[PDB]
Design a protein around this ligand. Structure first.
Ligand SMILES: [Ca+2]
Length: 80
């Protein structure tokens, strides 16, 4: 979609609405509309707020779904 260099949709992931592409759950509330319409950061993906709070909002739960994946999705792809 946007900054997606070929991710997966198996584990904690989210299918970028409108595009066959699938953005990881960690990318959701990462703070950057990776999807075509920021669906990844939007609530449609499960950000529990969409934008509001950048990388959080409702509470720890928001980071619980994102952070938990920050050790693989973002800490294991093909950039570093
Ligand atoms: Ca993203």
């Amino acid at each position: 979609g946007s900054k997606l260099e070929g991710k997966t949709c198996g584990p904690s992931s989210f299918s970028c609405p409108g595009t066959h592409v699938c953005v990881p759950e960690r990318w959701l509330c990462d703070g950057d509309k990776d999807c075509a319409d920021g669906a990844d950061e939007s609530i449609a993906a499960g950000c529990l707020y969409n934008s509001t709070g950048s990388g959080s909002g409702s509470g720890s739960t928001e980071e619980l779904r994102v952070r938990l994946a920050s050790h693989l999705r973002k800490l294991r792809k093909r950039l570093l």
